[PDB]
Amino acid sequence: RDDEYDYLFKVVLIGDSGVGKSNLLSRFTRNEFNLESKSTIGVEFATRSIQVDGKTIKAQIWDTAGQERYRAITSAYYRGAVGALLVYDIAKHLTYENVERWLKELRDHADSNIVIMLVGNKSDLRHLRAVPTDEARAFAEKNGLSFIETSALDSTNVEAAFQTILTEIY
């Protein structure tokens, strides 16, 4: 009797594959599928319900749809979205250039009134930061978006940001 909630916000995980969006919300969120659905469905589901303003809010996290197939149904993927998380790798400068394309992907299909958070995660455990934090944090505030740069070890900053995004909606 812990699946009870009041509201249901919908946020999505977008960006390039391999950045580790799936493994970032491993300890926080709860994947509702016991087996990988990216290889089949293309999209994976996970959720984490918290209490905001006296009400239990269960946010629904839709994982990366993937480039290879099922791009036509990404229109329904982006629809009804409340928030979005851009996760690029700080070691790979290419992932920082593609998030500019995923942003324009939201402006075409996803809802206009969405709150997006740009996340720079250190997945590549062997390389330095090709993307400067200064220029990364500056670019995020130029598009009216939030920003946070985290690592695989300290999962403290991540969970605190997930509690903030949901509160702003209500």
Binding site: D6, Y7, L35
Partner: protein, 224 residues
């Protein structure tokens, strides 16, 4: 595989369908609380005004709701008796017409077709008189409770004449807020039912996707 787009888009609509109902539920319930607290404070201020007649008239109004209740009983039993009386009228008419054909042709009493038209006709009247007498006693008993409840009410009207007059605006306002809360109760109970059907439709539109995901995994194990 092509079933996915139909599920996600409906999962999408169901998500909004949940939030739109819980919000209305949160609103309807809030307006329900606002009235019950309003009904609570406005009833007490009438108790602090003239409370001498309020508690003394309660036996009357409680003896009046009984009279009304015993009235609907005597009213339903009358309709059920009136209906049960028309059963015999259509039954005894059939068993009377059969006797008429017996006087016309006396040799008809050996005809197997006429014996069957009597057998079923004389069977209905057996079951008709049974349901009649049962409905007849109920008609009289429910009428007795009515006349008794009319006595209980009228007698209490004599004793508490001055009482019910000073307490009349209390019970009148009490019922006005009753129906209002009753309506607000219905608008909450059904919205929480619609909310459940919204969450349920959302919970089932996820499990099928897990089935689809697990269905492909089994096909990826064997041959194409």
């Amino acid at each position: 595989d092509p079933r996915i787009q139909g599920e996600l888009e409906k999962l999408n609509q169901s998500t909004d369908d949940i939030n739109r109902r819980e919000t209305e539920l949160e609103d309807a319930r809030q307006k329900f609380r606002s009235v019950l607290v309003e009904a609570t404070v406005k009833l007490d201020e009438l108790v602090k005004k003239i409370g001498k007649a309020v508690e003394d008239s309660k036996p009357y109004w409680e003896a009046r709701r009984v009279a009304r209740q015993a009235q609907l009983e005597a009213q339903k039993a009358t309709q059920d008796f009136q209906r049960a009386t028309e059963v015999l009228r259509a039954a005894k008419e059939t068993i009377s017409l059969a006797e008429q054909r017996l006087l016309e042709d006396d040799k008809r009493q050996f005809d197997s077709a006429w014996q069957e038209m009597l057998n079923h006709a004389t069977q209905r009247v057996m079951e008709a008189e049974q349901t009649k007498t049962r409905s007849e006693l109920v008609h009289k008993e429910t009428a007795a409770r009515y006349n008794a409840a009319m006595g209980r009410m009228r007698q209490l009207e004599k004793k508490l004449k001055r009482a019910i007059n000073k307490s009349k605006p209390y019970f009148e306002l009490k019922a006005k807020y009753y129906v209002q809360l009753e309506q607000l109760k219905k608008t909450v109970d059904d919205l929480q039912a619609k909310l459940t059907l919204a969450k349920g439709e959302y919970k089932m539109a996820l499990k099928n996707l897990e089935m689809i995901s697990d269905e492909i995994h089994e096909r990826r194990r064997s041959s194409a």
